[PDB]
Write a protein that binds this ligand. Structure first.
Ligand SMILES: O=c1[nH]nc([C@@H]2CCCN(c3ncnc4[nH]c5cc(F)ccc5c34)C2)o1
Length: 167
């Protein structure tokens, strides 16, 4: 038993809720919140901008030090940093950004990072401003992640479409 509430169960291990991941993170304090990161960890908008704003820019400060030491992430890759006031840890995962022409097949590699964590609160990778079809992203998530994932979907309309079209 864990503290996630109001989720609809899609599979053995995947759950979905219409929620603001920032507010969901603020109430649950999960062990891991996933950020929809880019390779530079520049948290300017979308989920990343909202998560970073909720940390009062501490996420960005930590991220800039990470990049200065390690260089950029790979598309499909990830790093574990602090969760600040939102979670114990933040798993920054880089899904492909369709608006940059990145290969959508890298979406599976991106979701594989979730398997290193027993339980996660996460957005749909490559959705929103990253330009992928959230229904495809959900399918890849279900077919790739084997650990327990609680998906927060900000937009109520998209949430309803994802549930109603789920196979
Ligand atoms: O048309 C819409 N509406 N919503 C979206 C996307 C869906 C996939 C990723 N993404 C999110 N997913 C889950 N929680 C979120 N909290 C946020 C706060 C913000 F300021 C910006 C984005 C999000 C967000 C928005 O596409």
């Amino acid at each position: 038993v864990n503290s996630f509430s109001g989720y609809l169960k899609l599979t053995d291990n995947v759950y979905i809720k219409n929620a603001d991941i920032v507010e969901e993170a603020k109430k649950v304090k999960p062990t891991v919140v996933v950020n929809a990161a880019n390779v530079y960890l520049k948290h300017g908008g979308g989920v990343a901008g909202a998560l970073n704003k909720a940390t009062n820019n501490a996420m960005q400060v930590e991220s800039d030090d990470y990049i200065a030491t390690n260089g950029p992430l790979k598309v499909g890759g990830s790093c574990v940093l602090s969760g600040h006031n939102l979670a114990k840890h933040c798993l920054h995962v880089v899904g492909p950004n369709v608006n940059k022409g990145e290969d959508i097949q890298l979406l599976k590699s991106a979701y594989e990072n979730f398997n290193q964590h027993e339980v996660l609160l996460a957005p749909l990778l490559s959705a929103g401003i990253f330009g992928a079809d959230p229904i495809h992203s959900l399918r890849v998530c279900v077919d790739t992640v084997r650990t327990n994932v609680y998906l927060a979907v900000f937009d109520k309309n998209l949430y309803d479409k994802l549930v109603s079209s789920f196979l």
